[PDB]
């Protein structure tokens, strides 16, 4: 592989390091906020940490934030349909 | 239909290569054995 590809293959462990220490590096005490919310994701990124931006985008790729919220909403309404009458509920309504 | 889903190795130094060579079949279970079975007795019978 090319010298640039060898460079990127050696920056891979910096990616897993940055993603590992993300909750204490990507806080607001560490980098004073120019809080940029990640796109289609509820993560704010204090400070331009582009390695962390790539890792957190690759985690939350393909609209995983909305899919997590949708799955939690639909599973909770599954719970509320399982327990409809014994809480005195007429119906549930998955809001638009 | 005739492939197993559980494979038991008598000698303990084979389940770790069996993990590698059977990643095309993740449906199968590769466990070791505490009971060893004398299949060298199969060698001792004249036919085999």
């Amino acid at each position: 592989l090319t010298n640039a590809q060898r460079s990127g293959l050696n920056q891979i462990p910096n990616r897993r390091f940055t993603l590992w220490w993300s909750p204490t590096i990507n806080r607001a005490n560490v980098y004073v906020g120019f809080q940029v919310q990640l796109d289609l994701t509820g993560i704010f990124m204090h400070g331009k940490i582009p390695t962390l931006k790539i890792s957190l985008i690759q985690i939350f790729r393909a609209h995983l934030w909305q899919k997590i919220h949708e799955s939690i909403v639909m599973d909770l309404c599954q719970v509320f349909d399982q327990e409809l009458d014994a809480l005195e509920i007429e119906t549930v309504q998955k809001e638009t | 239909e005739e492939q197993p889903k559980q494979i038991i190795v008598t000698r303990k130094g084979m389940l770790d290569p069996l993990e590698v060579h059977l990643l095309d079949f993740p449906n199968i279970v590769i466990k070791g054995s505490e009971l060893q079975l004398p299949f060298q007795a199969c060698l001792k019978v004249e036919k085999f």
Binding site: - | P4, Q6, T10, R11, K31, S33, L37, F39, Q40, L43
Partner: protein, 48 residues
């Protein structure tokens, strides 16, 4: 790591799930044959 096949877990060998035993001990075997004057040979023989 799966529970190794003990003498209290071997009863699971005979349910509907098809199980194999792989005994690889006898794969590589030799015979060690002497003539007295000269030297000593070791013939690798076939295994199973």
């Amino acid at each position: 790591t799966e529970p190794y096949l003990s003498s209290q877990n071997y009863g699971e060998l005979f349910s509907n799930q098809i199980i194999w035993f792989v005994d690889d001990t006898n794969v590589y075997r030799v015979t060690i044959h002497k003539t007295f004057e000269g030297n000593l040979t070791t013939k690798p023989i076939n295994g199973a």
